[PDB]
Enzyme design. Structure first.
Site, mmCIF file in Angstrom:
data_model
loop_
_atom_site.group_PDB
_atom_site.id
_atom_site.type_symbol
_atom_site.label_atom_id
_atom_site.label_comp_id
_atom_site.label_asym_id
_atom_site.label_seq_id
_atom_site.Cartn_x
_atom_site.Cartn_y
_atom_site.Cartn_z
ATOM 1 N N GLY A 14 0.846 -1.219 -0.040
ATOM 2 C CA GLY A 14 0.017 -0.046 0.177
ATOM 3 C C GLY A 14 0.832 1.312 -0.140
ATOM 4 N N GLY A 16 1.111 5.508 1.910
ATOM 5 C CA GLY A 16 0.881 6.502 3.251
ATOM 6 C C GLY A 16 1.503 7.709 2.796
ATOM 7 C CG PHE A 18 5.598 12.756 3.350
ATOM 8 C CD1 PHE A 18 5.823 13.718 2.486
ATOM 9 C CD2 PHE A 18 4.779 13.038 4.706
ATOM 10 C CE1 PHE A 18 5.153 14.939 2.512
ATOM 11 C CE2 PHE A 18 4.433 14.630 4.829
ATOM 12 C CZ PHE A 18 4.485 15.189 3.611
ATOM 13 N N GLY A 19 5.608 7.995 1.985
ATOM 14 C CA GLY A 19 6.297 6.539 2.192
ATOM 15 C C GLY A 19 5.321 5.600 1.751
ATOM 16 C CD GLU A 20 6.821 0.989 -2.097
ATOM 17 O OE1 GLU A 20 8.099 1.147 -2.149
ATOM 18 O OE2 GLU A 20 6.469 -0.057 -2.985
ATOM 19 C CE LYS A 36 4.999 6.315 5.841
ATOM 20 N NZ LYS A 36 3.930 6.934 6.417
ATOM 21 C CG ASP A 126 -3.728 12.236 7.504
ATOM 22 O OD1 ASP A 126 -4.735 12.834 6.676
ATOM 23 O OD2 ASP A 126 -2.966 11.303 6.953
HETATM 24 N N1 F92 Z 1 -1.432 -3.875 6.958
HETATM 25 C C1 F92 Z 1 -0.644 -2.830 7.297
HETATM 26 N N2 F92 Z 1 -0.297 -3.168 8.693
HETATM 27 C C2 F92 Z 1 0.433 -2.099 9.322
HETATM 28 C C3 F92 Z 1 0.496 -0.857 8.673
HETATM 29 C C4 F92 Z 1 0.103 -0.906 7.231
HETATM 30 C C5 F92 Z 1 0.078 0.430 6.680
HETATM 31 C C6 F92 Z 1 1.138 1.448 6.662
HETATM 32 C C7 F92 Z 1 2.279 1.409 7.384
HETATM 33 C C8 F92 Z 1 2.859 2.587 7.971
HETATM 34 C C9 F92 Z 1 4.064 2.709 8.809
HETATM 35 C C10 F92 Z 1 4.822 1.428 8.564
HETATM 36 F F1 F92 Z 1 6.050 1.554 9.099
HETATM 37 C C11 F92 Z 1 4.414 0.409 7.631
HETATM 38 C C12 F92 Z 1 3.065 0.296 7.307
HETATM 39 N N3 F92 Z 1 0.885 2.421 5.987
HETATM 40 C C13 F92 Z 1 -0.301 2.208 5.588
HETATM 41 N N4 F92 Z 1 -0.583 1.204 5.915
HETATM 42 C C14 F92 Z 1 -2.136 0.304 5.463
HETATM 43 C C15 F92 Z 1 -3.348 1.411 5.303
HETATM 44 C C16 F92 Z 1 -4.363 0.656 4.728
HETATM 45 C C17 F92 Z 1 -3.821 0.517 3.348
HETATM 46 O O1 F92 Z 1 -4.955 -0.274 2.776
HETATM 47 C C18 F92 Z 1 -2.888 -0.564 3.405
HETATM 48 C C19 F92 Z 1 -1.926 -0.058 4.058
HETATM 49 N N5 F92 Z 1 -0.613 -1.797 6.715
#
Ligand code: F92
Ligand code: CL
Length: 293
Positions: A14, A16, A18-20, A36, A126
């Site tokens: 997915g 977020g 400022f990151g993937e 991320k 957010d």
């Molecule tokens: N399933 C799941 N577990 C933990 C974090 C994330 C996640 C994170 C994330 C944030 C920081 C981190 F270090 C790692 C992941 N950012 C977005 N997401 C989810 C938001 C919803 C989208 O449908 C999938 C991704 N995803």
């Protein structure tokens, strides 16, 4: 692509602030994690500050555990507890309406979640359904609504002064336009009130299926945000919250808070728990999505 000594980087999952996002695995513990990645070449790097905010939160209830921050090839990487689907994903699974019971179980938890964030001297800024995730299936915590993505957070108590940040106005607006508070649209510094107002907007989105300012477009992002703010101001609470008196009470209360004011989190919870009980609902975590794929 290893992150740190022990985290293997796997498939994409997915996006977020400022990151993937990739699935990862702690090879030392045989546990999956979420990773991320932010390009080191980013013009606007947000991941390290986000790591600091997660550390400032520690873990409370519904706060994902952070395991690592460090370089990974041409990326900075942060390793988090793996969670389950977002509320937006679950909303889609439930045909884009939630029952009052499900919304109240969410709301009661997220008032507490936000109170926790505020207790660690942060405002979130957010609120959106994509940033609230259940735990993993057959996890001790699939029932728990977690909060993710602290890239837009801010310390609202200055650590130097121990004082609340001053009121001021800003050119750039923080957060997701669909949910942000009316005052956010006006360029005001956000404070605790604004996080709770945005939650209120999100609750109404879930109950109604949509918000009345959703379909607005413009030639510039600034004009688009202005039109959305105008519609929020022009929509009476009694209209937005038709058929949900307690939501009207919630939204009026949070809209009327002063910039510096500590919300009465207990009062807001009690609006919803009194309603929950009056309706004969049982707090059993039988959300609308239970028993769906
Ligand atoms: N399933 C799941 N577990 C933990 C974090 C994330 C996640 C994170 C994330 C944030 C920081 C981190 F270090 C790692 C992941 N950012 C977005 N997401 C989810 C938001 C919803 C989208 O449908 C999938 C991704 N995803
Ligand atoms: Cl993996």
């Amino acid at each position: 692509l290893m992150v740190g000594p022990n985290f293997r980087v796997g498939k994409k999952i997915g996006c977020g602030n400022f990151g993937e996002l990739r699935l990862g695995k702690n090879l030392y513990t045989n546990e999956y994690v979420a990773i991320k990645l932010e390009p080191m070449k980013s013009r606007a790097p947000q991941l390290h500050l986000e790591y600091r905010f997660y550390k400032q939160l520690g873990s409370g209830d519904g706060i994902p555990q952070v395991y690592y921050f460090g370089p990974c090839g041409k990326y900075n990487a942060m390793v988090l507890e793996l969670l389950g689907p977002s509320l937006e994903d679950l909303f889609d699974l439930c045909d884009r309406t939630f029952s009052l019971k499900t919304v109240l179980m969410i709301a009661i938890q997220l008032i507490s979640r936000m109170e926790y964030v505020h207790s660690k001297n942060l405002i979130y800024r957010d609120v959106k359904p994509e940033n609230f995730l259940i735990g993993r299936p057959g996890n001790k915590t699939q029932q728990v609504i977690h909060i993710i993505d602290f890239a837009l957070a801010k310390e609202y108590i200055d650590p130097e002064t121990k004082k609340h940040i001053p009121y001021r106005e800003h050119k750039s607006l923080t957060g997701t336009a669909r949910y942000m508070s009316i005052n956010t649209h006006l360029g005001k510094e956000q404070s605790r009130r604004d996080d709770l107002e945005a939650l209120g907007h999100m609750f109404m989105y879930f109950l109604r299926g949509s918000l009345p300012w959703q379909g607005l477009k413009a030639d510039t992002l600034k004009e688009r945000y202005q039109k959305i703010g105008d519609t929020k101001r022009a929509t009476p609470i009694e209209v937005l919250c038709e058929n949900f008196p307690e939501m009207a009470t919630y939204l009026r209360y949070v809209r009327r808070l002063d910039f510096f004011e500590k919300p009465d989190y207990d009062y807001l919870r009690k609006l919803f728990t009194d309603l929950f009980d009056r309706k004969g609902y049982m707090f059993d975590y039988e959300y609308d999505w239970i028993g769906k794929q």
